[PDB]
Nucleic acid binder design. Sequence first.
DNA 1: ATCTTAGGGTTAGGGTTAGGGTTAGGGTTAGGGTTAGGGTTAGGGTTAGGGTTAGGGTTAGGGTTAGGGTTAGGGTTAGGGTTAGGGTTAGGGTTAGGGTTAGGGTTAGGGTTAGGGTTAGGGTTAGGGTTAGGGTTAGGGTGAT
DNA 2: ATCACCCTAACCCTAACCCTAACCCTAACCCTAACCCTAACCCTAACCCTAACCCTAACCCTAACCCTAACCCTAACCCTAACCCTAACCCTAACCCTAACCCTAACCCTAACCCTAACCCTAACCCTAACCCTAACCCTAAGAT
Lengths: 65, 59, 98, 98, 99, 98, 110, 110, 83, 85
Amino acid sequence: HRARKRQAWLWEEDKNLRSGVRKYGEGNWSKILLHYKFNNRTSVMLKDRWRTMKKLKLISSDSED
Amino acid sequence: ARKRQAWLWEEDKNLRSGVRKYGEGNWSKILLHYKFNNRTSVMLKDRWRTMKKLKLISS
Amino acid sequence: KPHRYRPGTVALREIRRYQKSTELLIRKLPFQRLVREIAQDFKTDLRFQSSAVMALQEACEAYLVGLFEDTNLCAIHAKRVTIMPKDIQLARRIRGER
Amino acid sequence: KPHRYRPGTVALREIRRYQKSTELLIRKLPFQRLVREIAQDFKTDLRFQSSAVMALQEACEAYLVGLFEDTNLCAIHAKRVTIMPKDIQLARRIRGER
Amino acid sequence: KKRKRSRKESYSVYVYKVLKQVHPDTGISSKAMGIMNSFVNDIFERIAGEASRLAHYNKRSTITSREIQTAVRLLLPGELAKHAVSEGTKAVTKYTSSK
Amino acid sequence: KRKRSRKESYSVYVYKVLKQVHPDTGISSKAMGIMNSFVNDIFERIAGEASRLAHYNKRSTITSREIQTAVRLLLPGELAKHAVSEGTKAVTKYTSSK
Amino acid sequence: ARAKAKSRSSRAGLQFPVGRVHRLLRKGNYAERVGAGAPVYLAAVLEYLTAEILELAGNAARDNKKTRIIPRHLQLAIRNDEELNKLLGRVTIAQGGVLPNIQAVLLPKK
Amino acid sequence: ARAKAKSRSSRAGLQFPVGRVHRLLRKGNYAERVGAGAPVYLAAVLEYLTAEILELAGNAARDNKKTRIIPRHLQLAIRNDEELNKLLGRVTIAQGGVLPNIQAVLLPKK
Amino acid sequence: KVLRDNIQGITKPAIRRLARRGGVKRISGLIYEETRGVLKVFLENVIRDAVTYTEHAKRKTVTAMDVVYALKRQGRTLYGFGG
Amino acid sequence: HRKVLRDNIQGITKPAIRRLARRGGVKRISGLIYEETRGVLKVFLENVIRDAVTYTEHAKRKTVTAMDVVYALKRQGRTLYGFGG
DNA sequence: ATCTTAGGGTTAGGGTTAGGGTTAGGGTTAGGGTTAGGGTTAGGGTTAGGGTTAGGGTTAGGGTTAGGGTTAGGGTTAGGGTTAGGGTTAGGGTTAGGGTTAGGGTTAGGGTTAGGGTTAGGGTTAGGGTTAGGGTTAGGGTGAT
DNA sequence: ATCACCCTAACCCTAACCCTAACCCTAACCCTAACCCTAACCCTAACCCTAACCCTAACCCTAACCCTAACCCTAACCCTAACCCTAACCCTAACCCTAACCCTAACCCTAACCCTAACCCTAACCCTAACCCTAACCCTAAGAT
């Protein structure tokens, strides 16, 4: 929205999201938002960012199985 | 894509009235409310940015 | 003991990362300093165009990438996966650089 | 008991022998026939000056000698003394001939 | 009145025409056009130099289509040479027919 | 009474230099062919580089500057230094004698 | 009274400039004289080579679902064609990158 | 009347032909015009390079107890000199052979 | 003033990236210093030739075309930067 | 007259290849080298002869001269001295 | 049932054309002038295709061993994961050094021609190089200490 | 390891021969000297672009570390393929002869190329509005508990 300035994702937050998705498990966007540090992000924002990272192959590839 | 198509008075004044009615940023719904023949949401956005750059817009 | 990737999995991931991309892999400011320092020997008070340094960087990166391709072939020829300086020496030896 | 040099002695004598002289090491007539056979593919009823066949022979011999120098280096890099066709392939790949 | 600005030349227009022949909808970036310009100039110099050497060897003072054809056969590899020779001959024939 | 065309070469010129360097050393015909090839090769190299330099600089004349810059580009190191010295020496003497 | 001007490229059915090629041949110090056929043949050859590369580059860009050709696409096209690779073996494309290739020995042994 | 002609090589103090070199430059399609000092400079450089090679070749010949330079001697002179080898790296001398060189690992154990 | 030890600016992380684009899976620790030397030699040759071209033109600025010519004469043609 | 030629690549015998290797400084030679070397010589010649014949054909001649071979070699980056270059 | 997640739809902002205008700058056409090269012929030179021989080089095979191929095991690195912080990157200015353009001279290089100095080709000869035959020394091999 | 013979091959030395380099002579060809003529290059001066330089600020890449496993390296063992030597034989090297066939100079002559001058035409900038690409954000629609 106009009130909320569009800002980009910092290396600090991609790491954090990366980490949590590992530990707290993919899809637990609320608790990842709780235990890590982000720049006034919301639960959905983490969702959108994870989707974008998968699109751009910044996620560690799915493990051979 | 299609040829370049310019902006006349009609789709200018409607867009001004729309930014007034549906509020700025709400381009998609403004598109629906008013008749902007052959004008996509992004076209609405770029047109208003052109308004801002050219000082053709004032309350 | 948290989830740890065995070595070689991350190496293959990066190989794929950097063989897919096209950006320069050496930071610009250090390389510019290097270029200016090298040129100091040949002539003093020498100005450089923005694009001249860019062209030099492109040439150097291409050169090093080609050299490592050849180096990797030499290393594989010796039943190794690890490149060593002798591999580089041999590759430059055969290319004519020596 | 008759005399027999150990393996690798006569090879070293031959190395010293042929690195000391300059004559061509491929018999002239067979090479001349090879040149004519290769050339008839491109064009028929084709004549050759004596000097043209000689120049071809000098070029071919020089090329093969240098290739063997590089091949031997690859063999030594693999901790071997015998050259193998993979060595020739590596040398030719690094030289840009393939 | 003011200092006039010297103009550079390029093959951007013609490369764009050729692209619109082969790929009507595809566009091309500025960096890619730079690369195409470099390519055309490189090949031009290669062919022209070879033709010049061919003319010098045979003690001729003119670079005709023969030398260009021989230069193409010497430089371009395999099929490239065959197709280029056909294209050159076709163009010369068409040019000669309509004066 | 057809006339066969004369063949120009650098033989007399090389023999004069040879007797300056080694007063009592001869040269075989094959070696003189090598020296002719060498002189023509270096001539072509220097003249071609001088040609491009003039073209790059939108100049329509090959001068001693262009030759000097070609020599600096082509000859490695001490060869380039000594060649530049010799050329400069020769042009100075030429200019002085008018 | 001068007849309408028809360009030399149009006469030869070409998109590359025959007149400019003629001037470059005349000014490049290649010979004393340049024939009338030489610029036509050279322009045709240059146009052919340009068409080949551009076709392959467009195919490469379509393979990546891109509507614009970038140097990457030219790099992929040239290095995936045996003859174009031979022609441009010693050429570096800026912002072109390398063609993806990992040796078989380095791949994971399952 | 006409003064007695002195060749341009004599004026420059050279042995190589300044006059012929000038002719070759003018007729070689190198440029539109050729300066007066260019042939002198180029002839001097050629003479220098010739003298260098010939010096080393004559030294090589003496070492073989020969009173006459053959291609072998030229090859030995070129390959045993760093800068000349650099200059003529991609050159093959006919009937020149190679420098004697065996790798240390190939020699006998003791 | 003068610059000093700028070669170390070509960091190990950067040399490992160049290797990976070359397809390399493991890299000995002694390569990093080797690569620095190689790079230095390549740059000196190219820059020497470029500066010669610049000096001939009576200019004090090394242009991209100067670098393009220097590379071409060393048998490494470069497309993209003019010519 | 002007009969065919066939198999002549085998005229580059095993001894000759060993001699060339010995000049190159080779002490031991695998048995698969001899066929390998024949192939390499096959390609090198074809490349050179093709260009040499192109030069000959441009001059409207039927005899390949030493100059043709010299020019052909030169354009492949292998300059040869001693044959009129 | 309600805050939470999935998935499709909208927007922000930087980047990329299309078109319209202006005009350096060269491409085309017409007509005059000059010469490079195509066409034809003759004649000399060159290479291809026969033959014959003898002697050196190749080829097939046996004996032997050295080096390549394989495996096992230990020590040494390289790399993955983590953290702190500083070096590079991104953005915003200023300025002056140098590259570029514009006239105005002028001297250097091209064009031409007569004549002589120089160089390539042909002829002739003697000495550096080679080949044959005879020692002589450097060094590889095996068996004994 | 360590000498001590035994034996082979590269080395040297002489002699003879020899054919190729080196010198001489001559005639044709091309370099030089002298004299116009003109434009490429040089010199000066103004003008504008961009490279060097200086700030601030925050990012994220780099450096450092610890801990393991994967890798390199070597040593021991086996076997088979390559080397060395011998004998039988074949095909290359050397020389000669002849006959088509090719290369090239001499001569003629005509398209083909060069060189101006007018006359446009098209490409090369510039600059602004319109459109595009893609990540960041939004809006509902089920849904775990």
